[PDB]
Amino acid sequence: SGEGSFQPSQENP
Amino acid sequence: GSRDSPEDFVYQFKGMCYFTNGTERVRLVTRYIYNREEYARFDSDVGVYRAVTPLGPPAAEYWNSQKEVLERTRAELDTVCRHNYQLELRTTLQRRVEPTVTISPLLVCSVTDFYPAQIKVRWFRNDQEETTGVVSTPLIRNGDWTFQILVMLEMTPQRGDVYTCHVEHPSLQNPIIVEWRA
Amino acid sequence: DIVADHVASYGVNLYQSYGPSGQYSHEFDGDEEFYVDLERKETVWQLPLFRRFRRFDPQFALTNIAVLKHNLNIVIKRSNSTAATNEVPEVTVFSKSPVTLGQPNTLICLVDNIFPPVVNITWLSNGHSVTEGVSETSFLSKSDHSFFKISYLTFLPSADEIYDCKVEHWGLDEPLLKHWEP
């Protein structure tokens, strides 16, 4: 089973 | 020198999980860092993104306004923290490496290559625990998933005295006892 | 700061303008489970056990880094180009196990308080360079957002050899040479 990973939010230019 | 070194702009994103009492308590904190400044974060206990420094208002505001992103982040307590804990439970949390205990000539008891971190190392003189002249190093992290700790004993050898180093560790059901006589 | 039985980083993400360069790794209770080689696009587990029972999609790491890059350029502007400040690193050298001449051992070089995360850690034997038997961890995170890194030199204790861990970092007035003898 694949390891989980936090996903970073994207800054707004 | 340091003042004329190359210019560098650094960004860091830390997705962290905090586990207590098995699976009873779980908490996550994602950290957005500029250079060494954490400017924005999400704490599952808070439930929303918060600005940590003046650099974060634009970010925390924008991210809390994205419904999907916000729900995805809250859901990481499950898709990431809880999900991965089960994986730790069948590998890391079962890793057990028994410490190698050695005594060498004031008197040093070397407790090497063990895992997990929890340990208790004590000095005894004629089966009586030493309460002074005992100095331990901090828990030493080797980086290869093993720890090390050295505990010295300041003593004035008098004849017949038997010194022993007692080590307790989760990998051992029975304490490790090593003797040393002058 | 936060107390818990276990702490994990299921996303120590790093990206910096110098290079440019990045890093992606997972840590559990202070040790590195794996890092993703961003060039070879592969996951590299740090323990045989992990390499044998767990897996991680390298793509999640690659995708995350592209996001850190996007975020960095935007924060660089929001901060009016405030560049990273070099920290002074600290070096420590010690053996993995007790030293008995002739018996295989490993010298460990701990380089702490590293920032920015760019550094050269090399080994010297009797004053000359040595690359055989040398290895090192990735950059390990710290709560104050600086890093630490550990280099290793497998060796055979002998009365004919003295070593030095040489550390080069922009924050130092000169290269650091931490000595160690059998």
Tab-separated table of C-alpha atoms in Angstrom:
chain	number	residue	atom	x	y	z
A	1	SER	CA	0.000	0.000	0.000
A	2	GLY	CA	1.346	3.390	-1.061
A	3	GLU	CA	2.808	5.740	1.524
A	4	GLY	CA	0.715	8.862	2.190
A	5	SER	CA	2.071	12.352	1.510
A	6	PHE	CA	1.027	15.867	2.534
A	7	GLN	CA	0.305	18.086	-0.475
A	8	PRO	CA	1.387	21.758	-0.308
A	9	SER	CA	-1.104	24.519	-0.995
A	10	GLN	CA	-0.232	26.907	-3.821
A	11	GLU	CA	0.535	30.572	-3.235
A	12	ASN	CA	-1.447	33.141	-5.246
A	13	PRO	CA	0.748	35.487	-7.351
B	1	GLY	CA	33.747	34.778	3.733
B	2	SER	CA	30.239	34.457	5.148
B	3	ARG	CA	29.402	38.004	4.046
B	4	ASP	CA	30.242	37.336	0.394
B	5	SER	CA	28.759	33.847	0.076
B	6	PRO	CA	26.311	33.089	-2.753
B	7	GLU	CA	22.789	34.443	-2.268
B	8	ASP	CA	20.178	31.776	-1.506
B	9	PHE	CA	16.405	31.899	-1.076
B	10	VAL	CA	15.051	28.792	0.674
B	11	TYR	CA	11.575	27.310	0.882
B	12	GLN	CA	10.404	24.522	3.176
B	13	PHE	CA	7.123	22.651	3.505
B	14	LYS	CA	6.708	20.291	6.433
B	15	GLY	CA	3.753	17.928	6.680
B	16	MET	CA	3.924	16.610	10.220
B	17	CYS	CA	1.950	14.074	12.246
B	18	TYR	CA	1.798	13.738	16.034
B	19	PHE	CA	0.774	10.398	17.566
B	20	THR	CA	-0.015	9.690	21.242
B	21	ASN	CA	-1.425	6.639	23.045
B	22	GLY	CA	-1.365	4.352	20.026
B	23	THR	CA	-4.110	5.519	17.664
B	24	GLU	CA	-6.088	7.292	20.399
B	25	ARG	CA	-4.709	10.758	19.689
B	26	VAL	CA	-3.652	12.025	16.267
B	27	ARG	CA	-2.784	15.577	15.242
B	28	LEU	CA	-1.208	17.068	12.134
B	29	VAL	CA	0.501	20.372	11.468
B	30	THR	CA	1.618	21.509	8.019
B	31	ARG	CA	4.231	24.278	8.054
B	32	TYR	CA	5.075	26.761	5.290
B	33	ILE	CA	8.560	28.140	5.833
B	34	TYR	CA	10.412	30.970	4.061
B	35	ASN	CA	14.156	30.624	4.717
B	36	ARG	CA	13.841	29.755	8.448
B	37	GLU	CA	10.600	31.670	9.040
B	38	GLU	CA	7.415	29.636	9.374
B	39	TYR	CA	4.869	32.080	7.927
B	40	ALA	CA	1.719	29.982	7.630
B	41	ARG	CA	0.418	26.706	9.038
B	42	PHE	CA	-2.566	24.390	9.333
B	43	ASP	CA	-3.246	22.684	12.675
B	44	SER	CA	-5.872	19.925	12.626
B	45	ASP	CA	-6.863	21.075	16.126
B	46	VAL	CA	-7.597	24.541	14.772
B	47	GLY	CA	-9.155	23.303	11.544
B	48	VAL	CA	-8.120	26.227	9.335
B	49	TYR	CA	-4.954	27.772	7.892
B	50	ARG	CA	-3.435	30.513	10.040
B	51	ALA	CA	-0.835	33.173	9.331
B	52	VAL	CA	2.138	32.842	11.671
B	53	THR	CA	4.008	35.961	10.563
B	54	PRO	CA	3.237	39.059	8.435
B	55	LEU	CA	4.174	37.014	5.360
B	56	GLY	CA	1.262	34.646	5.841
B	57	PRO	CA	-1.955	36.697	5.668
B	58	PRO	CA	-2.169	36.498	1.831
B	59	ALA	CA	-1.640	32.722	1.947
B	60	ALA	CA	-3.892	31.745	4.874
B	61	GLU	CA	-6.683	33.886	3.402
B	62	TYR	CA	-6.419	32.402	-0.069
B	63	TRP	CA	-6.168	28.808	1.147
B	64	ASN	CA	-9.106	28.974	3.549
B	65	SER	CA	-11.188	30.258	0.614
B	66	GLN	CA	-10.534	27.158	-1.497
B	67	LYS	CA	-13.197	24.724	-0.300
B	68	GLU	CA	-11.642	21.649	-1.926
B	69	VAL	CA	-8.121	22.418	-0.723
B	70	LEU	CA	-9.409	23.063	2.800
B	71	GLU	CA	-11.349	19.788	2.847
B	72	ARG	CA	-8.370	17.929	1.404
B	73	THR	CA	-6.084	19.301	4.125
B	74	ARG	CA	-8.501	18.362	6.920
B	75	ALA	CA	-8.770	14.916	5.358
B	76	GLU	CA	-4.999	14.384	5.494
B	77	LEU	CA	-5.350	13.438	9.158
B	78	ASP	CA	-6.772	10.235	7.672
B	79	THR	CA	-5.213	9.909	4.198
B	80	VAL	CA	-1.778	10.722	5.583
B	81	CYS	CA	-1.354	10.510	9.359
B	82	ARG	CA	-3.701	7.633	10.190
B	83	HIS	CA	-2.975	5.836	6.924
B	84	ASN	CA	0.795	5.921	7.445
B	85	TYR	CA	0.613	5.028	11.130
B	86	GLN	CA	-0.706	1.594	10.199
B	87	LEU	CA	2.334	1.201	7.953
B	88	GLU	CA	4.645	2.246	10.800
B	89	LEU	CA	2.877	-0.242	13.053
B	90	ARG	CA	4.023	-3.156	10.895
B	91	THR	CA	7.609	-2.000	10.355
B	92	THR	CA	9.151	0.860	12.374
B	93	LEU	CA	7.103	0.328	15.543
B	94	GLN	CA	8.257	-3.297	15.641
B	95	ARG	CA	11.953	-2.554	15.053
B	96	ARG	CA	13.912	-3.846	18.039
B	97	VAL	CA	17.685	-3.773	18.362
B	98	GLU	CA	19.249	-4.922	21.619
B	99	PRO	CA	21.951	-2.674	23.086
B	100	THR	CA	25.496	-3.975	23.316
B	101	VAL	CA	26.733	-3.204	26.822
B	102	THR	CA	30.438	-2.758	27.493
B	103	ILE	CA	32.467	-1.531	30.456
B	104	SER	CA	35.981	-0.150	30.123
B	105	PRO	CA	38.363	1.781	32.426
B	106	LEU	CA	36.645	6.868	35.565
B	107	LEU	CA	34.592	3.830	34.554
B	108	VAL	CA	32.608	4.029	31.309
B	109	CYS	CA	29.600	1.891	30.456
B	110	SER	CA	29.052	1.968	26.696
B	111	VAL	CA	25.507	1.128	25.614
B	112	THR	CA	25.661	0.954	21.817
B	113	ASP	CA	23.487	0.258	18.764
B	114	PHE	CA	19.939	0.114	20.097
B	115	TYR	CA	16.421	1.039	18.988
B	116	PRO	CA	13.920	2.419	19.993
B	117	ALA	CA	15.189	5.368	22.048
B	118	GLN	CA	13.807	4.396	25.478
B	119	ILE	CA	16.544	3.153	27.837
B	120	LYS	CA	17.595	3.141	31.463
B	121	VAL	CA	21.261	2.754	32.331
B	122	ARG	CA	22.375	2.671	35.961
B	123	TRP	CA	25.580	1.996	37.885
B	124	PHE	CA	25.712	-0.253	40.959
B	125	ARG	CA	28.481	-0.846	43.495
B	126	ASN	CA	28.136	-4.180	45.303
B	127	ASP	CA	24.490	-4.410	44.201
B	128	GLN	CA	23.739	-0.905	45.493
B	129	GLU	CA	22.781	1.831	43.022
B	130	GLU	CA	25.213	4.737	42.693
B	131	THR	CA	23.682	8.134	43.455
B	132	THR	CA	26.747	10.291	42.810
B	133	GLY	CA	29.810	10.440	40.590
B	134	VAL	CA	27.610	9.275	37.733
B	135	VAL	CA	27.551	11.293	34.517
B	136	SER	CA	25.722	10.326	31.340
B	137	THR	CA	25.983	11.654	27.816
B	138	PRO	CA	22.766	12.797	26.143
B	139	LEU	CA	20.987	10.147	24.059
B	140	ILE	CA	23.210	9.939	20.951
B	141	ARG	CA	21.482	9.581	17.557
B	142	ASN	CA	23.692	7.720	15.065
B	143	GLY	CA	21.478	8.519	12.091
B	144	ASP	CA	21.365	4.915	10.895
B	145	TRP	CA	18.374	4.089	13.100
B	146	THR	CA	20.430	3.161	16.162
B	147	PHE	CA	21.194	5.092	19.317
B	148	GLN	CA	24.109	5.122	21.695
B	149	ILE	CA	24.615	6.387	25.264
B	150	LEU	CA	27.689	6.452	27.523
B	151	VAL	CA	27.477	6.622	31.321
B	152	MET	CA	30.641	7.181	33.350
B	153	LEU	CA	31.222	6.483	37.024
B	154	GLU	CA	33.676	8.354	39.239
B	155	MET	CA	34.886	5.810	41.792
B	156	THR	CA	37.686	5.037	44.239
B	157	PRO	CA	38.326	1.268	43.818
B	158	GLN	CA	38.501	-0.462	47.058
B	159	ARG	CA	39.100	-4.173	47.269
B	160	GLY	CA	36.430	-6.629	46.770
B	161	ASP	CA	34.065	-4.063	45.279
B	162	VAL	CA	32.027	-5.286	42.316
B	163	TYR	CA	30.679	-2.655	39.933
B	164	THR	CA	27.889	-3.411	37.492
B	165	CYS	CA	26.107	-1.483	34.761
B	166	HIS	CA	22.387	-2.193	34.529
B	167	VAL	CA	20.621	-1.561	31.232
B	168	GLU	CA	16.886	-1.863	30.603
B	169	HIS	CA	15.428	-1.606	27.092
B	170	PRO	CA	12.135	-2.706	25.424
B	171	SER	CA	14.095	-5.207	23.312
B	172	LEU	CA	15.048	-6.975	26.554
B	173	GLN	CA	12.631	-8.791	28.846
B	174	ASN	CA	15.454	-9.126	31.377
B	175	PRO	CA	17.875	-6.314	32.340
B	176	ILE	CA	21.399	-6.557	30.930
B	177	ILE	CA	23.916	-6.641	33.774
B	178	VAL	CA	27.650	-6.333	33.127
B	179	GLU	CA	30.235	-6.632	35.923
B	180	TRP	CA	33.690	-5.131	36.353
B	181	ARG	CA	36.298	-5.792	39.038
B	182	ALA	CA	39.700	-4.127	39.435
C	1	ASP	CA	7.061	22.337	21.449
C	2	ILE	CA	4.339	19.743	20.781
C	3	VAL	CA	4.541	16.662	23.009
C	4	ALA	CA	3.606	13.278	21.573
C	5	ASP	CA	4.668	9.647	21.720
C	6	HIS	CA	5.699	9.779	18.067
C	7	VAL	CA	6.432	12.550	15.584
C	8	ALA	CA	6.634	12.045	11.829
C	9	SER	CA	7.326	14.191	8.779
C	10	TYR	CA	5.457	12.748	5.823
C	11	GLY	CA	6.766	15.568	3.816
C	12	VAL	CA	10.051	17.215	4.692
C	13	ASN	CA	9.989	19.254	1.461
C	14	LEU	CA	12.860	21.567	0.516
C	15	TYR	CA	13.591	23.834	-2.455
C	16	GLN	CA	16.205	26.592	-2.719
C	17	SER	CA	17.258	29.047	-5.430
C	18	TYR	CA	20.954	28.196	-5.103
C	19	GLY	CA	21.477	25.478	-7.703
C	20	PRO	CA	18.574	25.350	-7.879
C	21	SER	CA	18.145	22.310	-5.638
C	22	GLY	CA	15.511	20.486	-3.630
C	23	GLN	CA	14.994	17.552	-1.291
C	24	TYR	CA	12.080	15.286	-0.393
C	25	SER	CA	12.169	12.825	2.478
C	26	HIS	CA	10.030	11.214	5.181
C	27	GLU	CA	11.155	11.013	8.787
C	28	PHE	CA	9.725	9.124	11.764
C	29	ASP	CA	10.846	9.871	15.328
C	30	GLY	CA	13.854	11.808	14.073
C	31	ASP	CA	15.267	9.350	11.526
C	32	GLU	CA	14.996	9.250	7.735
C	33	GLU	CA	12.769	6.537	6.282
C	34	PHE	CA	13.589	7.583	2.723
C	35	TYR	CA	14.381	10.404	0.319
C	36	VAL	CA	13.452	10.686	-3.341
C	37	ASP	CA	16.348	11.099	-5.755
C	38	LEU	CA	14.980	13.985	-7.832
C	39	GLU	CA	17.373	13.248	-10.708
C	40	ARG	CA	16.875	9.494	-11.020
C	41	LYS	CA	13.223	9.958	-9.996
C	42	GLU	CA	13.424	7.073	-7.501
C	43	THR	CA	12.547	6.462	-3.878
C	44	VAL	CA	15.537	5.372	-1.793
C	45	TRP	CA	14.632	3.723	1.502
C	46	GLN	CA	17.128	3.880	4.354
C	47	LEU	CA	16.445	0.452	5.926
C	48	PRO	CA	16.314	-3.047	4.329
C	49	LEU	CA	13.033	-3.601	6.169
C	50	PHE	CA	11.407	-0.550	4.527
C	51	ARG	CA	12.866	-1.273	1.094
C	52	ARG	CA	11.326	-4.732	1.458
C	53	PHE	CA	7.838	-3.897	2.763
C	54	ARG	CA	6.914	-0.328	1.823
C	55	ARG	CA	6.659	1.858	-1.262
C	56	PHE	CA	6.273	5.528	-2.206
C	57	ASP	CA	5.295	7.136	-5.515
C	58	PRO	CA	8.291	9.368	-6.460
C	59	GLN	CA	5.925	11.504	-8.537
C	60	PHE	CA	4.213	12.908	-5.423
C	61	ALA	CA	7.610	14.242	-4.403
C	62	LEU	CA	8.416	15.696	-7.853
C	63	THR	CA	5.015	17.356	-8.035
C	64	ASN	CA	5.378	18.787	-4.514
C	65	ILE	CA	8.762	20.332	-5.360
C	66	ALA	CA	7.361	22.124	-8.426
C	67	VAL	CA	4.832	23.641	-6.030
C	68	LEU	CA	7.513	24.716	-3.549
C	69	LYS	CA	9.336	26.397	-6.457
C	70	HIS	CA	6.155	28.241	-7.444
C	71	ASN	CA	5.599	29.305	-3.815
C	72	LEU	CA	9.220	30.392	-3.255
C	73	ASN	CA	9.343	32.880	-6.146
C	74	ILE	CA	6.137	34.472	-4.901
C	75	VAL	CA	7.316	34.799	-1.291
C	76	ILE	CA	10.697	36.102	-2.447
C	77	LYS	CA	8.778	39.050	-3.886
C	78	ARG	CA	6.417	39.439	-0.941
C	79	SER	CA	9.469	39.736	1.343
C	80	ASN	CA	11.287	42.206	-0.918
C	81	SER	CA	13.956	39.593	-1.594
C	82	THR	CA	15.005	38.856	1.992
C	83	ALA	CA	17.748	36.264	1.509
C	84	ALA	CA	18.660	33.409	3.843
C	85	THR	CA	21.096	34.255	6.642
C	86	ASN	CA	23.974	31.800	7.104
C	87	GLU	CA	24.041	30.046	10.480
C	88	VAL	CA	27.264	28.851	12.085
C	89	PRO	CA	27.291	25.044	12.038
C	90	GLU	CA	28.691	22.806	14.780
C	91	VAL	CA	30.575	19.564	14.169
C	92	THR	CA	31.012	16.480	16.349
C	93	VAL	CA	32.891	13.244	15.648
C	94	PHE	CA	32.478	9.909	17.425
C	95	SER	CA	32.673	6.176	16.798
C	96	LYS	CA	29.598	3.995	16.337
C	97	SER	CA	30.957	1.372	18.731
C	98	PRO	CA	33.765	1.074	21.317
C	99	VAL	CA	37.227	1.205	19.753
C	100	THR	CA	39.289	-1.998	19.781
C	101	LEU	CA	42.306	-1.936	17.451
C	102	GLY	CA	41.820	-4.208	14.467
C	103	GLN	CA	38.058	-4.546	14.857
C	104	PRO	CA	35.878	-2.918	12.144
C	105	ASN	CA	34.240	0.298	13.326
C	106	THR	CA	32.622	3.427	11.893
C	107	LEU	CA	33.421	7.083	12.520
C	108	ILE	CA	30.369	9.331	12.624
C	109	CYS	CA	30.475	13.036	11.829
C	110	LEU	CA	27.452	15.013	13.034
C	111	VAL	CA	27.063	18.439	11.410
C	112	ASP	CA	24.375	20.383	13.288
C	113	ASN	CA	22.669	23.784	12.927
C	114	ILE	CA	23.098	23.812	9.158
C	115	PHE	CA	21.553	26.713	7.271
C	116	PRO	CA	21.135	27.287	4.437
C	117	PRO	CA	21.129	23.544	3.522
C	118	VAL	CA	24.287	23.515	1.401
C	119	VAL	CA	27.450	21.967	2.809
C	120	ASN	CA	30.541	19.860	2.099
C	121	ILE	CA	31.409	17.083	4.546
C	122	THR	CA	34.557	15.117	3.744
C	123	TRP	CA	37.008	12.909	5.617
C	124	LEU	CA	40.772	13.060	6.098
C	125	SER	CA	43.135	10.285	7.174
C	126	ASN	CA	46.587	11.318	8.374
C	127	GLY	CA	45.861	14.619	6.670
C	128	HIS	CA	44.860	13.268	3.257
C	129	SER	CA	41.460	12.775	1.604
C	130	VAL	CA	39.573	9.498	1.829
C	131	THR	CA	36.459	8.591	-0.160
C	132	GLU	CA	36.439	4.823	0.335
C	133	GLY	CA	33.857	3.733	2.898
C	134	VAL	CA	32.293	7.198	3.141
C	135	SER	CA	28.532	7.831	3.096
C	136	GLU	CA	26.013	10.303	4.500
C	137	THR	CA	22.380	10.986	5.291
C	138	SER	CA	20.201	13.583	3.588
C	139	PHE	CA	19.529	16.850	5.416
C	140	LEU	CA	17.519	16.013	8.542
C	141	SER	CA	14.984	18.590	9.720
C	142	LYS	CA	15.042	20.485	13.035
C	143	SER	CA	12.129	22.292	14.701
C	144	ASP	CA	13.883	25.671	14.384
C	145	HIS	CA	14.038	24.891	10.636
C	146	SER	CA	17.755	24.570	10.322
C	147	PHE	CA	19.132	21.111	9.447
C	148	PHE	CA	21.709	18.566	10.482
C	149	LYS	CA	23.516	15.933	8.432
C	150	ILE	CA	25.637	12.944	9.348
C	151	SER	CA	28.556	11.518	7.390
C	152	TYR	CA	30.105	8.098	7.983
C	153	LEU	CA	33.564	6.634	7.443
C	154	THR	CA	33.865	2.866	7.880
C	155	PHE	CA	37.336	2.133	9.214
C	156	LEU	CA	39.589	-0.353	10.974
C	157	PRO	CA	41.021	1.109	14.205
C	158	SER	CA	44.806	1.339	14.029
C	159	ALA	CA	47.717	3.021	15.776
C	160	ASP	CA	48.865	4.199	12.346
C	161	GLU	CA	45.874	6.428	11.596
C	162	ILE	CA	44.251	9.613	12.873
C	163	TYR	CA	41.207	11.204	11.254
C	164	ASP	CA	39.472	14.503	10.629
C	165	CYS	CA	35.982	15.398	9.517
C	166	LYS	CA	36.266	18.463	7.289
C	167	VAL	CA	33.237	20.711	7.027
C	168	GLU	CA	32.776	23.579	4.583
C	169	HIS	CA	29.837	25.948	4.935
C	170	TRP	CA	29.261	29.590	3.992
C	171	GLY	CA	28.593	30.437	7.627
C	172	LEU	CA	32.118	29.511	8.751
C	173	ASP	CA	35.109	31.860	8.832
C	174	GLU	CA	37.162	28.890	7.673
C	175	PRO	CA	36.708	25.154	7.019
C	176	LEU	CA	36.140	23.140	10.193
C	177	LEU	CA	38.403	20.213	11.022
C	178	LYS	CA	37.138	18.101	13.910
C	179	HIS	CA	39.817	15.601	14.946
C	180	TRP	CA	39.445	12.060	16.294
C	181	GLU	CA	42.005	9.451	17.400
C	182	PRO	CA	41.893	5.753	18.465
